[PDB]
Write a protein that binds this ligand. Structure first.
Ligand SMILES: Nc1ncnc2c1ncn2[C@@H]1O[C@H](COP(=O)(O)CP(=O)(O)OP(=O)(O)O)[C@@H](O)[C@H]1O
Ligand SMILES: [Fe+2]
Ligand SMILES: [K+]
Ligand SMILES: [Mn+2]
Length: 567
């Protein structure tokens, strides 16, 4: 067996720590550090817990690993930006896999994989497609913010890159920060976009062309000599430019004691909704930039299949429009397009180099921890809450959803990536015209303007959506067909876009059975599926996590394993 543990996350100036374990090209385990630590974004840490989970899941120790793979070229970033790489491989392993958690007789070979190659690998090798164009659109790797590559015969060959200061990723985050939504919540900005109107998608900054874009505002070779990414350099240029061309100045953060909460809370001086027009304009600019990049790499490669990874690959709206583009026939974007995925991608690149063949992900992201009925019962018994073990959990849950109740659903292996896909989900009626406001304002405490997304059977997705394809990851938006746009109001956005999950019997029989039961009740086997967590909070992972969230929120029921808890 070829066993490769892929890692991301490092104690110095890092985010999105994660670990993935490949055994013979298959994902044996994969987790995000934040889910286990409950510390959002997995900042400034080696993926200690995620890696410990991965080994436990597969029943391995480090001595059973053929290789450890890291999803950045770290030595190169230390040599370039920090005056030298001071670690032997052994010292580096001691940092990535601390010996108090990871005892080992000897050191496995350590591989550093160039960051965008790792991003690329996470898309290509898991797509189930033999070849295609590669588009990596990121905040920043070691130097570059964009990579165009050709995937074929199991090789990834880089065609061109874009330097970091021209980052579309940073641009989008800077706008997000500017609006008061936050640089770490660009998904919020994407949601805001449809509520606004675009006048000038250049933002007096971008020039667009057939192959991508230009940013003559920023010197493309600009480097921050005091950090190792160009975030703060781009932040300055973008903030100054935006305050000049846009009617509103930056939204400022307000920190004040709230006597109702007994804490200093952080808020914004203005409502971010006021910036909706800027959001719409930023979204249009990104889309236009990315359309050019994608057309360019597809034409240069002679391919009609497009792979996308990198943080910007989380832009589901953009992904949905790429899909409908005349230059695109098939498209694969992995659930872990962002940096959490470079652990998996580093592991794949190394596994391939070692002669392994990589299995396609196959319509599931479900690779984190799961818990046995006995483990769930211990967590239940700890809280002292009453509960049942229904003879037909799926039918009962469907009935709860049909009646307008909000049901926690914590089953099987935790999903990896930022979307809940029926392993750690909160379920609601897709047909309710009040469900959206209820979950936003009462349950999860989000902005009224945030949209929700549906899970549905692959079998009906042709009738519901304007595209007939698998949408396993909620990473692409698409238009709802006419009859359903008014039938499914809690899960349609301002522009009749939705961000669907299609469910097959194979990928998740339990969820599939549930939706089938739901379709018998409300006509359509579709439900609202938002992630199981308070807004802002990491998706719940453990049964204790699920119970804490269940009890802090006005959720009606929780189906956790085979058990049903009712408020
Ligand atoms: N059809 C659609 N069109 C545009 N945006 C959509 C959409 N469907 C969902 N979204 C948005 O995608 C964004 C998700 O980004 P995230 O940063 O992951 C916030 P979240 O994690 O979904 O919220 P949560 O913490 O309350 O669970 C949200 O703004 C969500 O509203
Ligand atoms: Fe990245
Ligand atoms: K098409
Ligand atoms: Mn969520």
């Amino acid at each position: 067996h070829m066993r490769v543990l892929g890692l991301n996350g490092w104690p110095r100036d890092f985010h999105d720590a994660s670990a993935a374990l490949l055994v013979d090209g298959r994902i044996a385990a994969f987790a995000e550090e934040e889910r286990l630590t409950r510390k959002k974004h997995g900042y400034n840490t080696a993926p200690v817990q995620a890696a410990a989970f991965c080994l436990a899941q597969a029943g391995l120790t480090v001595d059973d690993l053929d290789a450890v793979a890291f999803g950045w070229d770290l030595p190169a970033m230390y040599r370039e930006r920090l005056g030298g790489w001071p670690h032997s491989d052994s010292e580096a392993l001691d940092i990535l896999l601390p010996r108090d958690v990871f005892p080992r007789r000897t050191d496995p070979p350590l591989h550093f994989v160039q960051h965008h190659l790792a991003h690329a690998a996470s898309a290509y090798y898991f797509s189930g497609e033999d070849r295609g164009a590669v588009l990596i659109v990121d905040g920043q790797g070691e130097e570059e913010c964009v990579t165009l590559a050709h995937a074929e015969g199991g090789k990834i060959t880089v065609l061109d890159t874009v330097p970091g200061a021209w980052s579309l990723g940073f641009f989008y985050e800077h706008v997000s920060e500017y609006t008061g939504l936050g640089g770490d919540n660009p998904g919020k900005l994407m949601g805001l976009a449809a509520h606004g109107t675009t006048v000038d998608e250049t933002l007096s900054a971008f020039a667009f062309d057939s192959d991508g874009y230009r940013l003559n505002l920023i010197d493309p070779q600009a480097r921050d000599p005091e950090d190792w990414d160009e975030y703060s350099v781009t932040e300055r240029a973008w903030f100054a430019h935006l305050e000049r061309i846009y009617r509103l100045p930056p939204n400022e953060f307000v920190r004040r004691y709230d006597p109702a909460k007994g804490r200093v809370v952080r808020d914004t001086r203005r409502d971010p909704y006021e910036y909706r027009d800027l959001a719409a304009t930023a979204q249009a600019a990104l889309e236009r930039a990315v359309f050019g990049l994608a057309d360019s790499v597809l034409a240069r490669t002679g391919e009609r299949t497009l792979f996308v990874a990198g943080g910007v690959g989380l832009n589901a709206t953009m992904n949905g429009k790429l899909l409908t583009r005349s230059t695109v026939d098939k498209m694969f974007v992995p659930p872990v397009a962002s940096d959490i995925g470079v652990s998996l991608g580093a592991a794949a690149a190394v596994a391939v180099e070692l002669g392994d063949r990589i299995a396609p992900m196959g319509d599931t992201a479900a690779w984190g921890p799961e818990f046995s009925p006995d483990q769930v019962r211990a967590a239940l018994d700890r809280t002292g809450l009453a509960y049942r073990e229904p003879a037909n959990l799926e039918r009962e849950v469907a009935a709860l959803i049909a009646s307008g109740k909000v049901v926690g659903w914590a089953q099987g292996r935790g999903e990896v990536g930022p979307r809940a896909l029926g392993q750690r989900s909160l379920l609601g009626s897709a047909h309710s015209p009040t469900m959206r406001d209820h979950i936003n304002l009462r349950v999860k405490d989000r902005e009224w303007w945030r949209p929700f997304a549906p899970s549905m059977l692959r079998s009906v997705s042709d009738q519901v959506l304007e595209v007939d394809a698998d949408f396993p990851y909620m990473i692409m938006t698409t238009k709802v067909r006419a009859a359903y746009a008014e039938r499914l109001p809690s899960v349609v956005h301002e522009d009749w876009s939705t961000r669907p999950q299609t469910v097959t019997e194979a990928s998740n029989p339990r969820y599939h059975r549930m939706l089938t039961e739901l379709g018998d009740l409300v006509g359509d086997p579709v439900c609202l599926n938002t992630s199981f967590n308070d807004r802002g909070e990491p998706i719940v992972s453990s049964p204790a996590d699920a119970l804490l969230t269940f009890s802090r929120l006005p959720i009606d029921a929780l189906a956790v394993g085979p058990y049903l808890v009712t408020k």
